[PDB]
Amino acid sequence: SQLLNYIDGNFVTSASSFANINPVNGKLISDVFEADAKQVNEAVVAAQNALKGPWGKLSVQDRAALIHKIADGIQARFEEFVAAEVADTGRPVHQARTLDIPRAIANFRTFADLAKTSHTDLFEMSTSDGSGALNYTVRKPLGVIGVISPWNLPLLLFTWKVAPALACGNTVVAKPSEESPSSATLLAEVMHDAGVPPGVFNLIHGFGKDSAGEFLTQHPGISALTFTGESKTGSTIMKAVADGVKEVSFELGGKNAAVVFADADLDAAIEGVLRSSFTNSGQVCLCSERVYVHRSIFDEFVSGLKVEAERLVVGYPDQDGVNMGPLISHGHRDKVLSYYRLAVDEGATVVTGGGVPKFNDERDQGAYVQPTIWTGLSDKARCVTEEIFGPVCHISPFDDEDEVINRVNDSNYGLACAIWTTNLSRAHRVSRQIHVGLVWVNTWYLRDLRTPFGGVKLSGLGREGGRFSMDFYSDIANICIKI
Amino acid sequence: SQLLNYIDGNFVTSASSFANINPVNGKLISDVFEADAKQVNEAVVAAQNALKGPWGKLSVQDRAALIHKIADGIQARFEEFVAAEVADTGRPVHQARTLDIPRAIANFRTFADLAKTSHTDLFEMSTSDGSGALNYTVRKPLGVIGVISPWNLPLLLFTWKVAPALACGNTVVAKPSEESPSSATLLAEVMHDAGVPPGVFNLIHGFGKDSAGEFLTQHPGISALTFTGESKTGSTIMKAVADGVKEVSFELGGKNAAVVFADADLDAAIEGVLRSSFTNSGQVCLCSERVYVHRSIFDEFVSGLKVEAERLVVGYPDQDGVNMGPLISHGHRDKVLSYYRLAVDEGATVVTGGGVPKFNDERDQGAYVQPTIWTGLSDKARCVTEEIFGPVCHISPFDDEDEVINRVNDSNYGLACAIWTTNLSRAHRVSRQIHVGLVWVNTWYLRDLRTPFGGVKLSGLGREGGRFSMDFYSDIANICIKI
Amino acid sequence: SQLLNYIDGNFVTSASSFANINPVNGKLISDVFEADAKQVNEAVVAAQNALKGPWGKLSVQDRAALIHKIADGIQARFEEFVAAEVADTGRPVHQARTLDIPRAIANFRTFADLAKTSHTDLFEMSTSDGSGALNYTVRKPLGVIGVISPWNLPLLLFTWKVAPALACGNTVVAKPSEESPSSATLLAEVMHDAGVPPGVFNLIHGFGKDSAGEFLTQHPGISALTFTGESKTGSTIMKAVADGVKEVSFELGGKNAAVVFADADLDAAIEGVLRSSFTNSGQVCLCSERVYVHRSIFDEFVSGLKVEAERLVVGYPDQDGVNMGPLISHGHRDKVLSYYRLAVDEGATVVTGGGVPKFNDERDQGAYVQPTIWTGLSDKARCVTEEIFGPVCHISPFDDEDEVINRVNDSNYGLACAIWTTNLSRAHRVSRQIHVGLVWVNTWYLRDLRTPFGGVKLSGLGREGGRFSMDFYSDIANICIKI
Amino acid sequence: SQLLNYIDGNFVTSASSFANINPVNGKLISDVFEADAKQVNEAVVAAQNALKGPWGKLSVQDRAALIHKIADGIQARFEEFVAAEVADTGRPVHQARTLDIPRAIANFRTFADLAKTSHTDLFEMSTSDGSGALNYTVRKPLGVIGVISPWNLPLLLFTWKVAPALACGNTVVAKPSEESPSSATLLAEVMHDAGVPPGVFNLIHGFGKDSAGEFLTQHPGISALTFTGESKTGSTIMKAVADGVKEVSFELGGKNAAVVFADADLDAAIEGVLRSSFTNSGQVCLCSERVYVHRSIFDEFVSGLKVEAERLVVGYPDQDGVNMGPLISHGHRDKVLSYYRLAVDEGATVVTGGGVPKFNDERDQGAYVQPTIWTGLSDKARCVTEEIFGPVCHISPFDDEDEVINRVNDSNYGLACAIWTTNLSRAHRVSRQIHVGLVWVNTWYLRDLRTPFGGVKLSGLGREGGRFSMDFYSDIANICIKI
C-alpha cells in the first residue's frame, strides 16, 4: 500500500519514500512519500490562502457542523480506522476499538461544541470627560497551525491538536510520526469526502531533522506550532521558531510516579499500577515508571503485581485475551532493551520480565518485549530518572508522607502522578503538593476533555485542554471604543 | 548617587559599575553596580529558597494585604519616585505624576485584588462503574520568575510584571534596563521596609548580552521569563531558555498605524495622532509611526498636525508648558537621527522637524530630537516598515476601506492600531479586521487593567492583562478523584 | 377526540374537551382534552418519580444525546410541525418554516450542548490550623419544572422552557396555551418515539383559572414555575406558588419603543419598524407599539411607512406573497378592536388601517385585523401606554436626545427597544440609558441563544438565556471539605 | 439610649417608639422609633432620587473606594459595634469580636472588590448579509433595594445584603429586626460620617405586619426585596410584592442534619456537633437540630456529647470561658420551652438539659435556657421535623448510607448538612446526594465569601454569594449592534 501527502485538496507523491513497518512481525505495510521543502511551502501557502476563502467566511455554527461531519465520517469508516491504527503500531484491536478511535471522534465533536458555546468579554469604564468607553474582546483564528505529532496514540493525539485548531477557524499543516502515518492519511480522505475546503487541512509525511518536520518548523508562514514528543525535540523546535517568535504549545515526556499509601485498597492499587505501567506496552507519556509503596505493604504489593504482570497475554492484536502488543519499532526496542541491561548493571533485582518473549513464529521478527518490574535501585539511578517508554516499572518503598512527596518531586519532569489512598485528608493534602500537571487519586488516565491537560517543568510548555485550547488556537484581540 | 543590587534581603554592591546618565543635559546621576553571573546565581537561589519559607505559607489574603502595603509605601514616597523616573529618562514631570507612578501603584493594587477574587474550576464526570469522578483545578505559584524590563516606561512596565508575579505567589529576580535603574531600586527599598521576606524580590542591575540579563536568562533555577523589549531580543531570549523549556511571555516592538476616515472628527483626530505619535517623545511601543488619512482630508489633516506639532514645547521636565523631553540616551538618539536621514534618502518630504532643536544651553549636551512628520514614502520604504521608536510619523493618503485595511495589516508586527470615525458600523467592521492585539476607536492608550493587553505576530508571544496574567504567572494543576 | 394529554408515558383523554378553532376561518380544527386536578396530580407525581428512574441515572453526555434525538425527531417530522403551528395560529407558512420550527429544534440542540460544556467552581481557602479547605460547587436538577406558555410563538416558546429544563436533568409538566395546543401535542409524540422515559415529559391541556394552569401552579410537588404571558397573570402565579416558596421565572408584557434619529438610514429604519410593528400580526412581546422619530424626518418616515404597510398582504398562510395572518382568536380580535376605537376617542389620526379587512370569503369568519398606524396621541393616552398586542404602532415626533430617552423610559414595562442611528457615540451612549432588558441598534429581534433574554420592571421576574437558563433550571450546591 | 430612623441624610424620630430589651437581664436598653407608612414612603422616594444624584455618577472604582471607607468607619468604631451587638442579643463578647463585627467589615470589603473586578460578556454572531452583529451585556443598578433582616446575626446578615446592594450601585431602604436594632443604627452613623450621599442608605425601624416591614414590602417604588427570616414570612412577602412582580431573594428556615459515620474521627465529630448545635445558643439557621450516628458508635457518641454539653458555660457575654448567652428574648424562650415540653410528650429521653438554668442573680430575669439533647423520637416527631431555633439536638442511630441519605433528605427544608467521615469516596459520594445548598465535611460553618451561600426547597428562593449576589443586585442588560 501507498500513503500520499494531501496538499491543497490533492493527494500527491514525492521524490522519495520510506517504508512503514508492521511491528507485530517486521513486515512491510506501506510506502510513504516524504514531503520535501518545496512541498511543505506549497502546503503552508495553501493553508494561508484557505483562510481568505470559504472556510474563513463560515459562521461558527456552520464550521462546527462541518467538523461534526468530519466526526461522522470517521464513525462511518470506523473499522478501517481501527485496522490502520493496529497495523502501524501493533496496538491490541480491542483498545483501538474502545479508546483510540472513539476518542478521536470525540476530539472533533468536543471542540466543535466548545467553539459554539464560547464567548468573550465586555469591560465598561469611566473617562475624564464623563462619557465613558467600552473595551471588548474578539476571538479570531490565529492563522496557519503547524501540527507535529508522535507515534504512541497516533490518531488520538493528532486529532487532539487538529480538532481545536480547526474548531477555532485556523488552517492546518500537519506532520504525523514517520512510524504511524496511516490513520492520518485516512483522515485526509475523510476531510476531502466531507467537503472540507482545499487548503484547510494539509497532511505532510516525513521525519524530523532534515525532513518535513523541520521545514514546517522553520517556515515563516505558520503562526504557531503545537507539538507532542521528546523534551529534547521541544527545545530544538523552540529554537527553530524563535526568530518568527511563533506561538508554541508543547507536551513532552515525563518520568511519572505512582504512590501507594498503607491505607490504599491494595487490590485496586495493584490492578491500577498494572494498567498504569503496562497499558499500550508502557508507551504512554502518562505511564508510571517509578512506583513508591509504603514499607508496611511493599512485599505484598510487589508479589501481587508480579503475579498479575505474568498473567498478561503478550501477543497478536486480535489474539483472544491479549493485553500487550509489541513496541512501536525495532529501533525503539533497541533503546528499551538497552535500559533493561543498564538496570542490571546499576544493581536492579528483576522481579519479572527483563528481556523478550519467544514465539517460534513470525512475531520473533517483530519488536516485542516483556513487562518488566525492577526493585533495589536508588533514587539517583539512571533507570529511575530517565524516561524509557516501555512496559517497565521500578518499585521502591517509603516510610513518610513528606519523604515520598519530596522523592516524587525530585525530578526535572512534571507530567502526572497517581496516588492510592482511602483517606479523605491525605488525598487532598498530598495531591496539591505534587509538582505535576495531572494528579489521579485511585485511578489513572481517567479523562474529561474540558480539563487542562499538560505538565510542568521539562514535561511541557503551555497547556491545552478545554478553554486552554480555545485560548491557544485563537488570537484574542481587544477593541476599545471611546464614547 | 549609588544604586545597589538587592539580593536575599540585602543591598549589595558588585565588583564592577556603570554610569546612569540624565538625558536632559548628559550629566552623571549615579553609579550602578553591575551584578555578575555569581550574584545572579545567589538571587535565583535565594528566590528558590524564599518559596519554601514564610512567603510560601501566607494565605492568599495575607499575601494580598502585603502587596497593598508595597503600594502604600510607593505612595508614601510618591514624589521621590516621580523625581527618580524624571532624572533617568527626561520625562515631563506632569506625565510622571499622572501616568507613570500612579500606574505602578495601581498595578500592585489591581493584581492583589485579582488574586483575592480568583478561583478555579470543577468538573464532574461519569465513569463506567457508575460512581463518577471529580476533576478540580488548583492555582499554584509557577516558581521563580525572571523579569527583564525596558527603559521607556520604567516603573510602569517593571511593576506590570512584578505585581502579578508576586500576587500569584511567585518569587522574583528582576533586571531593569541599564538606562533607567533608579525607580526599581527605590522599589526594592519599599519592599524591604514593608517587610517582604528575604529572597521574594531580588533586584539585579546590568546589561543584556554577556551580563545580568543574559545570565538570568540562562539560569536553570527560573521557572519563567517575562520580557518587554525589542523583537530580536525576544528571539534571542527564546533561544536561551529553550533547553530548560521555560515559560516565556513577551511584549515586543510594533509599527503601529492610525487610520483617519473621511467622517472622522478631524480636529479630535489631529489632536489624537499628535498624542499617539509624540507622547513620551514617541518612545512607547504603542505609538503611531504610520498614519493613513482619507484623500479628501489628507491635506487639511497634514497642515493641522504640522501646526500642532510646532506648538509642542520641547524642554526641561519641569518647564512651564512642556510637552516633550529628550530621548532616553545619546545612543538611542544616534539610532533615531540615522532613520531621520534615511527618510530623506528614501524620498521623504520633511513636513516638520527632522533634526535636533538647538537650545544654546546645557540641554545641547542632552539627547533631544525634534518631533518629525514625513509625507511621500511608499509602503515599502524602510522608514515606513521598521520601528524607529522616536517622535515621528509618516502620513500617507488612501481612498478605500478595504485598501487601507490591507496596508495596515501588511507588516510583520501586530501591536496596536487607532482608528478615527464617527460611523457606528465602520468602527466595528474595521476594528475586527485589523490584525493587532489592541484597537482604539477615537482615542489612544485608554487603559482598563482588566483587559488582555499585548500584540500578535512579531509584537508578542503569549498575552498578559487580567486573567491572562493570572494564567501566565500561575501553575494550573488538575486533580482527579475517582469516587 | 383529537388532542390528548401525555402523562407518565401514555396519551390519555379527560372527562371534558374544548374546541380548538382555526383563526383563518373560524372552523373547528380539533377537540382538546382538558386535564383536571387529578390528572395534573398524576403528572406531577409521575415527574417526581421519573427523577428516580433511568432518567435520573443518565450521564450528562447521554442525556444530551437523547435531547439531540428529540431535536432529530422534530426535524424528521418538520412539515407536520409546520402544518400544526399554522393550523392553530394562522401564521404564514414561510415564517413557520424559517422561524418557528427551526428555532424549536435549535432550542433543544443549544441547551443539550450547554449542558455538556458547563462546569462549576473550585475555591481554595486557608484555615486557622494551616491545613486548608476546599469548597466546590455542583449542578443538580432542581426537580419538577412546571411550564406554562402562551399562544403567540407556541412551539418556540414552549421549547425555550422545556429544552433547558430537560437539559439540566429536570422532569417537566407542561401546559400549553388553550389557543395553540397542537404543536406541543406533536412534541409529546416525538418524545415518546425517541424513548424519553415515562414521567420525564408530561403534557397537560387546559385553561388558566379553575383549570390545568392554575392547578399546576398550586401543586406542592413542583420545584419551579416558568411562565410566559401577561403581567397580571404573572402576579397571580407568584401568589399561588408563595406558600411553597417555589422558584419562578417570568417573561411578561411590554410596551416597546423604537427610536429613529435624523442620521438613520431612513429606508432601513422604515423597513425595520415595519417588521418590528407587524411581524406575527404584531403579536410578539418584542414588537414596537410606540415609535419616536426625529422631527426633521418625521413626515417622510410616516409617509414611507404608510406605503409599506399598505403593501402588506394580509391573507391565507399559503397564499402567494402573504405577510400577515389573522390574530389568534375572535376574543383577542375584540380586545384589539376595542383599542382601535379607543385610539379614535383619544384623538388619534388614523394614518392607515383601523378596522378589519373585507375579504368576501371564508376569511371574513376568521380573526383578521388591518395593520394600523396612529399619529397625534399624547404620551399619556392609554393607547400609547397599554399593551395592545396587535399590528399597530403610534408614531410621535421628538426633538432632543434627553427628551426621547425619558419618554422611552416613562413606562411600567421594560422589555425591549430599537434604536436607529449611524452615529457611533450615540448608539452606545443612548442604548445604555434605556431601561429595558434588550436593545437592538439598526435591527430588531436579532437572536443569539447565548444571551440573557428578558425584560425588567413589570416585563419580567428573573432572567433566562445562556448560562442564565442553566442557573435557573439547576440547583447549585456548595460542598466544603475540611482538609 | 435612643435609636432613630435615618431617612434622606437625616436622623429622625417617629410618633411611636418601642422597647429594645437586653436578654441577659430583661433591662431596657433603648427606645426605638417605629417608622410609619409616610416615613417609609419618604425613604423609598429619597432612595429613588438618590439614583439620579452624585451616587449615580460615581465611577465603579470611586463607588468601591467609598464602600471601603464605610468598612474603615466600622473598623474605627470596632468596640462600639461589639458592645452594640452584644447588648441587643446577649451573644458572647468573643463571638462578636471574632465573627460578627469582622464579617460585617469583610462583607463591605469583599463586595467592593468584586464590584471592581467584575465584567460582562460579548457574543459575536453571523447574519444573512454577512456583516455580522454584536451582543454585549452591561451591568446596571437594579434600583431601590428593600432589605429586611433577622435578629440572630444582626450586623453580619444586614451587611450581607446592604453591601452588595451598594456595591452594584443601588440605593437601599433597610429594616432591621425590632429585636436587634443597635448595630444597624450605628451603621447609619458610619454611613453619614463617611459622606455617603443622602438617600443612598435609609434605615427604618419597626415590626413586620402593620409596620415598617410590610410597608416596605408593599411600596411600588422598590425594585427588589431581599429577605432573611422564617419560611412563612417568605411566603407573606412573596405575596405582597406579587402585584409589582419585584425581584426577590429569600434565605429562610432549615431543619439541618449532621451525620456521623462509623469511620469518623469520633472526638472531632463530638466537638463539631457540639459546636453545630449550640453556637449562638442554637440560634443560627445553620445549626444542626437532627443528628444521625452510625449504630456501631451511637452510644459512645451520645455519652461523649453529653459530657461536653454539660461542660458548656452559660452566662454573661464577658464571663470568663462563656460558651452560650441567653436566647434573644422571653417570647423566643417561650417558644423554645414549648418545644422542650412537646419533646417529652412525644416520648423523648432527655439526655441533658431540658429546662432553664438557675443563676441567683439578674440572669434569672433574662432569657436563658439550657443546652439540650434528646434521644428516642421517631423521624415523624414534630420536634424532629420543625425548626426550634434554640440549643437543641436529637440524636438517632442509622445503619446504611442510602438509608441515612433518605432520612436527611426527608424534609421540606434544605439549607445545610454536615457529614463526618475520614473516607475519601464517602465524603464526595454522600455529599452530592444531600438535597441542601451547603454541605460541610468534617467541619461546620467554615466560610469563603466567594461561594454561593443559600438553601433549596423551603429554605430559600434564589441564591446569593459571590457572583450570585452580583447577578441578583444588578440589572444585566443586553445590547445588540447590527454591523
Ligand SMILES: NC(=O)c1ccc[n+]([C@@H]2O[C@H](COP(=O)([O-])OP(=O)(O)OC[C@H]3O[C@@H](n4cnc5c(N)ncnc54)[C@H](O)[C@@H]3O)[C@@H](O)[C@H]2O)c1
Ligand atoms: N503529551 C505528552 O506529554 C506525550 C505523550 C506521548 C508521547 N510523548 C513523547 O513521545 C515520544 C515518542 O516519539 P520520539 O521519541 O520519536 O519523539 P521525537 O520528539 O523524536 O519526535 C516526535 C515527533 O517530532 C518530530 N520531530 C523529531 N525531530 C524533529 C525536529 N528537529 N523538527 C521538527 N520535528 C521533529 C517527529 O517526526 C515526530 O513527528 C517520547 O519520547 C515521549 O517523550 C509525550
Ligand SMILES: NC(=O)c1ccc[n+]([C@@H]2O[C@H](COP(=O)([O-])OP(=O)(O)OC[C@H]3O[C@@H](n4cnc5c(N)ncnc54)[C@H](O)[C@@H]3O)[C@@H](O)[C@H]2O)c1
Ligand atoms: N417574553 C415575553 O415577555 C412575552 C412573550 C410573548 C408573550 N407574552 C404575553 O403573551 C400573552 C398572550 O396572551 P394570554 O391571554 O395567552 O396571556 P395569559 O397570561 O392570560 O396566558 C398565558 C398562559 O397562562 C395560562 N394562564 C392564564 N391564567 C392563568 C392562571 N390564573 N394560572 C395559571 N396559568 C394561567 C394560560 O392558560 C396560558 O397557557 C400576551 O398577553 C403577552 O403579554 C409575553
Ligand SMILES: O=C/C=C/C=C(/O)C(=O)O
Ligand atoms: O496528551 C498526552 C496524553 C494524552 C491523552 C489524552 O487523552 C489527550 O492528550 O487528550
Ligand SMILES: O=C/C=C/C=C(/O)C(=O)O
Ligand atoms: O505594555 C506596553 C505598554 C503598556 C502600557 C500599559 O499601560 C501596560 O502594559 O500596562
Ligand code: NA
Ligand atoms: Na509502524
Ligand code: NA
Ligand atoms: Na539614564
Ligand code: NA
Ligand atoms: Na386555535
Ligand code: NA
Ligand atoms: Na433586644
